[PDB]
């Protein structure tokens, strides 16, 4: 009529702390309509390389947005979801209703630059205002880079140094007022023509189905802004008592792999939860009070032990900004070049399918296919197992596998973690037994084998004495507990002692040739390695 503004969701799937959205609503007073839009373009929101679980999480999130738009506006406002190429969709939408601006939350990773530039140039041509707002990260990543002399901080501690110089991150914006916004009704033939969904589709609509095995699902996950805010409330409630008490109870501090769909990692990845609101509610809770206690070596004062997790996120995000080669070794200036073994299909598949014969490794890989989430310590162990503390396969194969199956799976965060863990050759402790022995670790994290039997069901009738190391069973025990090694449960696809010695050697031989390391992404020190691996030291 008088025209419309598009708020275009890719990430930033939420109504709170949404600068791009307030900007789309900035013209309510002039009768400018609002069009909420999501486009399945075969890449957006992590949809080029995606499994069932994350696709389910994304759909949940879109439904929740639509539901909220509907709730606020007595049903007048809907999320329009298309399938196709955005420039093509947007040019023709313009034809139907004059777009005055198209607002997005900045997608900062280089993999989005092409997509976003096609719309930039489209907006220039059609004289549409192209409004881009930084909101997925705590700081504008360029700010951090220009502050560090034009290169991203390559260590956590150097990143902290930089954002200390910059100052605390922006607070979240106000909440959008939707009750008085106008929405548009489009010609039905346009809607059919541009493949606008009538109802949200299911993963199968995109030819995405059940995983490399399917139904080990013990816990499940609701995507969406609503669930995010519920989880944050629970988190804050728990912190509140800890704060009042002045400390964590010994078991709140323990890695619990038998626990939650209580993580907000996927919510943060899709932006159902604003990272600034998370930051600032933790800050406000701990504001102005000195504590003494600590959590896993990290002080509690100021909530540093939690805000610090958000910094790790920001730190990998920031490193990737100007590096379209961030997800590979060859050509990546911030990744040590390491002489990995050449791709070995059998070893790789065995790893993906959880068929390595190392119970904890298999349980974790299988949990990843089933539910799409692993505790930080299981991610650690299967990553070292794949790379420097086992198979000596390159970390790229791991990254690629995680990016498909993780409910979170940020491109930058996941690659960052893969490089950090696997390629930091100067970090001697990183090759220690406390990190490369999945058996010792499995005894710490899962003493009774309950987790293991949960996801490696063939070891179910195996008793506690043997569950972590079933190959220690004699022939008679193997037959009695219905589990022959080489039939029911595979043999260890490698000799770990030998593998580890060979690999530690390549690291030594690696350091001594370079002598002085080029700047690469790495642990700031040995203490940080302790924290990162949740080491009992
Ligand atoms: C090989 C590997 C791959 C990983 N891939 C991802 C990924 O694709 N997406 C992802 O969000 N995390 C990734 N991580 C990091 C981390 O394991 C998860 O963020 C963590 O398990 C989430 O559980 P939580 O929310 O309870 O973490 P919490 O301790 O509760 O922290 C909360 C949030 O802080 C952020 N955070 C915590 N740890 C890290 C970290 N090491 N790096 C970056 N951000 C962090 C996350 O957003 C996390 O949700 C990876 C780690 C490894 C070792
Ligand atoms: Mg969380």
From Swiss-Prot:
Binds 1 FAD per subunit. The bound form of FAD in the inactive state of cry is oxidized FAD, not reduced. After activation by blue light the FAD is in an anionic radical state, which would be paramagnetic. Green light, which reduces levels of radical intermediate, has an antagonistic effect on function. The keyword Nucleus applies. The keyword Amino-acid biosynthesis does not apply. It comes from the Eukaryota. Changing residue 395 to F: Abolishes formation of the FAD radical. Its cofactor is FAD. Keywords: Biological rhythms, Chromophore, Cytoplasm, FAD, Flavoprotein, Nucleotide-binding, Nucleus, Photoreceptor protein, Receptor, Repressor, Sensory transduction, Transcription, Transcription regulation. Disruption phenotype: Flies exhibit poor synchronization to light-dark cycles and show no response to brief light pulses. Mutant abolishes rhythmic tim and per expression in photoreceptor and glial cells, but not within certain pacemaker neurons of adult brain. FAD binds at residues 235, 263, 265, 309, 376, 408-410, 414, 417. Its main location: cytoplasm. GO terms for cellular component: cytoplasm; cytosol; nucleoplasm; nucleus; perinuclear region of cytoplasm. It is found in: Cytoplasm; Cytoplasm, Perinuclear region; Nucleus. Changing residue 408 to N: In cryb: Loss of accumulation. In photoreceptors, leads to an equivalent distribution of per in the nuclei in both day and night ultimately resulting in a slight decrease in Bdbt foci development. One of its GO terms (molecular function) is FAD binding. Residues 3-138 form the Photolyase/cryptochrome alpha/beta domain. Expressed at higher levels in the head than in body and it is more expressed in antennae than in legs, wings and mouth appendages. Prominent expression is seen in cells of the lateral brain, which are close to or coincident with the clock neurons. Abundance oscillates in a circadian manner. Induction: Expression is regulated by light and circadian rhythms. Under circadian regulation, expression is influenced by the clock pacemaker genes period, timeless, Clock and cycle. Pfam families: DNA_photolyase (PF00875), FAD_binding_7 (PF03441). One of its GO terms (biological process) is response to light stimulus. Interacts with tim and per; promoted by light conditions. Interaction with tim irreversibly commits tim to proteasomal degradation. Interacts with l(1)G0136/CG8198. Belongs to the DNA photolyase class-1 family. Unstable upon light exposure. Light induces the degradation of cry, likely due to conformational change in the photoreceptor leading to targeting to the proteasome. Appears to bind 5,10-methenyltetrahydrofolate at substoichiometric levels. FAD-binding region regulates cry stability, cry-tim interaction, and circadian photosensitivity. Photolyase/cryptochrome alpha/beta domain is sufficient for light detection and phototransduction. Blue light-dependent regulator that is the input of the circadian feedback loop. Has no photolyase activity for cyclobutane pyrimidine dimers or 6-4 photoproducts. Regulation of expression by light suggests a role in photoreception for locomotor activity rhythms. Functions, together with per, as a transcriptional repressor required for the oscillation of peripheral circadian clocks and for the correct specification of clock cells. Genes directly activated by the transcription factors Clock (Clk) and cycle (cyc) are repressed by cry. This is Cryptochrome-1.
């Amino acid at each position: 009529t008088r025209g419309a503004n598009v708020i275009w969701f890719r990430h930033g799937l939420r109504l709170h702390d949404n600068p791009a959205l307030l900007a789309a609503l900035a013209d309510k007073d002039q009768g400018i309509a609002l069009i909420p839009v999501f486009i399945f373009d075969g890449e957006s929101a992590g949809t080029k390389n995606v499994g069932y679980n994350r696709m389910r999480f994304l759909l949940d999130s879109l439904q929740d947005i639509d539901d909220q738009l509907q709730a606020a506006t007595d049903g007048r406002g809907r999320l329009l979801v298309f399938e196709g190429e955005p420039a093509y969709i947007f040019r023709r939408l313009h034809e139907q209703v004059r777009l005055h601006r198209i607002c997005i939350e900045q997608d900062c990773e280089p993999i989005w630059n092409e997509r976003d530039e096609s719309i930039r140039s489209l907006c220039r041509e059609l004289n549409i205002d192209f409004v881009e707002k930084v909101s997925h990260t705590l700081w504008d990543p360029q700010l951090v880079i220009e502050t560090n002399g034009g290169i991203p901080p390559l260590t956590y501690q150097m990143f902290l140094h930089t954002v200390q110089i910059i100052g605390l991150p922006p607070r979240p914006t106000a909440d959008a007022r939707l009750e008085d916004a106008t929405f548009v009704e489009l010609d039905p033939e346009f809607c059919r023509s541009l493949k606008l969904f009538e109802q949200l589709p299911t993963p199968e609509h995109f030819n995405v189905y059940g995983d490399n095995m399917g139904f080990l699902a013990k816990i499940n996950w609701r995507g969406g802004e609503t669930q995010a805010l519920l989880l944050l409330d629970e988190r804050l409630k728990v912190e509140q008592h800890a704060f009042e008490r002045g400390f964590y109870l010994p078991n709140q501090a323990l890695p619990n792999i038998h626990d939650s769909p209580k993580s907000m990692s996927a919510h943060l990845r899709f932006g159902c939860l604003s990272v600034r609101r998370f930051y600032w509610s933790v800050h406000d809770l701990f504001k102005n009070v000195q504590l003494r206690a600590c959590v896993r070596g990290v002080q509690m004062t100021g909530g540093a032990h939690i805000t610090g997790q958000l910094i790790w996120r920001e730190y990998f995000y920031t490193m990737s900004v100007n590096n379209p080669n961030y997800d590979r070794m060859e050509g990546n200036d911030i990744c040590l070049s390491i002489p990995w073994a050449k791709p070995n299909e059998n070893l790789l598949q065995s790893w993906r399918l959880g068929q390595t014969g190392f119970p904890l490794i298999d349980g974790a890989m299988r949990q990843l296919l089933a539910e799409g989430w692993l505790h930080h310590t299981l991610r650690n162990t299967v990553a070292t197992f794949l790379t420097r503390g086992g198979l000596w396969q390159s970390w790229e194969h791991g990254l690629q596998h995680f990016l498909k199956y993780l409910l979170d799976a940020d491109w930058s965060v996941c690659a960052g973690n893969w490089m950090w863990v696997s390629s930091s050759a100067f970090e001697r402790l990183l090759d220690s037994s406390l990190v490369t022995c999945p058996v010792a670790l499995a005894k710490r994290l899962d003493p009774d084998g309950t987790y293991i039997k949960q996801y490696v069901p063939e070891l179910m009738n195996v008793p506690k004495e043997f569950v972590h190391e079933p190959w220690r069973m004699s022939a008679e025990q193997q037959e009695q507990y219905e589990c022959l090694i080489g039939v029911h449960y595979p043999e260890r696809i490698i000799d770990l002692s030998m593998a580890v010695k060979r690999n530690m050697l390549a690291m030594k031989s690696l350091r001594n040739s370079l002598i002085t390391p080029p700047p690469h992404c790495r642990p700031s020190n040995e203490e940080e390695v302790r924290q990162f691996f949740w080491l009992a030291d």
